[PDB]
C-alpha cells in the first residue's frame, strides 16, 4: 500500500542529465565553506583554497 503514490511526470532527460544542485545552507560560521572544501577534495583529490 505504501508503494502507491500520485502519478507524476519526471522531465529529467534520459541522457546527459544536468549536475545536481547541492545547496550548503546554515547559520554564519557553522562551517559551510570547510564542508565544501572537504567534499571537493574527496571527489576530485584537489583542494580549493
Amino acid at each position: 500500500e505504501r508503494k502507491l503514490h500520485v502519478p507524476m511526470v519526471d522531465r529529467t532527460p534520459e541522457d546527459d542529465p544536468p549536475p545536481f544542485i547541492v545547496a550548503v545552507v546554515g547559520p554564519p560560521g557553522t562551517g559551510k565553506t570547510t564542508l565544501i572544501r572537504s567534499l571537493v577534495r574527496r571527489m576530485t583529490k584537489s583542494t580549493l583554497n
Binding site: 519526471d10 570547510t34 572544501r37 572537504s38 567534499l39 583542494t47
Partner: protein, 49 residues
C-alpha cells in the same frame, strides 16, 4: 521525516573534516535519488555559472 539521516562532524584539521565521515557523506549523496516536484518539472530554470 522520522529516521532521516543526520551526519556528525567532530572537528576541523587543516581546514578539513575527518576523512571517515566525509566518505560516509560522499557515498550517501552518490546513491541518492530525487523525487519529481511539480514546479521544477514544469518550468525551465538555470543557475548562472
Amino acid at each position: 521525516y522520522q529516521g532521516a539521516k543526520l551526519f556528525y562532524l567532530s572537528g576541523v584539521i587543516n581546514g578539513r573534516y575527518p576523512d571517515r565521515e566525509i566518505l560516509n557523506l560522499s557515498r550517501f549523496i552518490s546513491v541518492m535519488k530525487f523525487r519529481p516536484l511539480k514546479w521544477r518539472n514544469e518550468h525551465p530554470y538555470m543557475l548562472a555559472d
